[PDB]
Amino acid sequence: MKPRPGVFVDRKLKQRVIQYLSSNRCGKYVDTGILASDLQRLYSVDYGRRKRNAFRIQVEKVFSIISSEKELKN
């Protein structure tokens, strides 16, 4: 078994997203479904997998959590 890198379940989705929003809007009013398709498009080699539905859910929950957990307000 491998140790704990730092990301659990799908922390990258949150960390990656928060970093994308902070750096820039990364789109005009990117919603859950929009951010998901965008995140996968830019990271088709990494995120781009055979989980369109699963990935969509992750981005949906990550979008709501990043706002409530981090709270950037723009």
User: At a CB cut-off of 8 Å and minimum separation 6, what does 66 contact?
Assistant: 14, 17, 18, 21, 72
CA distance 34 to 26: 11
Closest Cα to residue 41, out of 28, 26, 61?
A: 26
For residue 73, the 8-state DSSP code is: -
Domain 1-74 CATH class label = mainly alpha
CA distance 37 to 34: 5
Q: Tokens 């789109």 label which residue? A: 27
Q: Where are the domains of the chain?
A: 1-74
Closest Cα to residue 72, out of 16, 19, 30, 35?
A: 19
DSSP string across 2-34: ----S--SSHHHHHHHHHHHHH---SSS--HHH
